[PDB]
């Protein structure tokens, strides 16, 4: 899925605790916001523990 | 004039190479340290600045 042309909003992304893994690669979750990217993609799959 | 021109050309080209040296990654993932500083957390940032 391609997402573009909008205000990125990850406040609910890190303020929640239902997730199990939130370690980001290269970009840091603290500096994730206030960064202007050209395009952002999102893949999704179901895998085992 | 040959003698008077090399002493200026060598200095100018050495200064140009010194300027161009800031455009190299030097084995890192980026050239400017500000990109890492504004992108990475401080523990991972300090390695790239080092």
UniProtKB/Swiss-Prot annotation, chain A:
The listed outcome for residue 18 to P is: In strain: Omicron/BA.1, Omicron/BA.2, Omicron/BA.2.12.1, Omicron/BA.2.75, Omicron/BA.4, Omicron/BA.5, Omicron/BQ.1.1, Omicron/XBB.1.5, Omicron/EG.5.1
Which superkingdom does the taxonomy of this entry point to? Viruses
Name the reported effect of residue 16 to F. In strain: Omicron/BA.2, Omicron/BA.2.12.1, Omicron/BA.2.75, Omicron/BA.4, Omicron/BA.5, Omicron/BQ.1.1, Omicron/XBB.1.5, Omicron/EG.5.1
Residue span of region Integrin-binding motif = 48-49
- UniProt effect for mutating residue 21 to A: In strain: Omicron/BA.2, Omicron/BA.2.12.1, Omicron/BA.4, Omicron/BA.5, Omicron/BQ.1.1, Omicron/XBB.1.5, Omicron/EG.5.1
Function (record text)? Attaches the virion to the cell membrane by interacting with host receptor, initiating the infection. The major receptor is host ACE2. When S2/S2' has been cleaved, binding to the receptor triggers direct fusion at the cell membrane. When S2/S2' has not been cleaved, binding to the receptor results in internalization of the virus by endocytosis using host TFRC and GRM2 and leading to fusion of the virion membrane with the host endosomal membrane. Alternatively, may use NRP1/NRP2 and integrin as entry receptors.
Q: How does it assemble?
A: Binds to host ACE2. RBD also interacts with the N-linked glycan on 'Asn-90' of ACE2. Cleavage of S generates a polybasic C-terminal sequence on S1 that binds to host Neuropilin-1 (NRP1) and Neuropilin-2 (NRP2) receptors. Interacts with host integrin alpha-5/beta-1 (ITGA5:ITGB1) and with ACE2 in complex with integrin alpha-5/beta-1 (ITGA5:ITGB1). May interact via cytoplasmic c-terminus with M protein. May interact (via N-terminus) with host bilirubin and biliverdin, thereby preventing antibody binding to the SARS-CoV-2 spike NTD via an allosteric mechanism.
Full protein name: Spike protein S1
Organism from which the protein derives: Severe acute respiratory syndrome coronavirus 2 (2019-nCoV)
Q: What broad taxonomic lineage does this protein's source fall under?
A: Viruses, Riboviria, Orthornavirae, Pisuviricota, Pisoniviricetes
Q: Which gene encodes it?
A: S
